[PDB]
Amino acid sequence: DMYIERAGDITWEKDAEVTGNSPRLDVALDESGDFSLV
């Protein structure tokens, strides 16, 4: 059986770790909800 525990509030925190890139990818979504690169 599965269960849930609270992890926190949903708010935007100022001065948070700013990391990550913005790639532009060509992808395909199949019938099983799976993405794959084109």
């Binding site: 949903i10 990391t19 913005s22 395909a28 979504l29 690169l37």
Partner: protein, 155 residues
Amino acid sequence: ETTDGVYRVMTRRLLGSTQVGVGVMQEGVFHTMWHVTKGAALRSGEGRLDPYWGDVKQDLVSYCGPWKLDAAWDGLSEVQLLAVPPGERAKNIQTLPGIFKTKDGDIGAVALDYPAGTSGSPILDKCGRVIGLYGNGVVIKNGSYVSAITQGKRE
């Protein structure tokens, strides 16, 4: 517990207590990714959550009521992933999304590498609104994971 906020999705079927995913409780409705729960009922303390809506292709599922998240990424602003990693405290990571160009239109993409058990973590806009859920995406050349910004439809 029907309290608004982000939640951990846990299981006791595997070794010890394993985190399989994450979800959002808003307006008495629990939202997560289909691949996390497979549509199975959830336990919330003494209480229980039954599924209400789901779609394998959209990889989404809502519990106790219809999908409630209607905010969308504006295509310009930086967003924040509220990542809840297994065994770790919830953490806000600010990023500028990329794009998933598909045959049916474009959708935002967050390029943040996190363990599988973090699938279902909300992506937020500057007003603190949930614009989508992280955890359905693809692995690219350098082995880095790029998730889509998965959002459902609100009636």
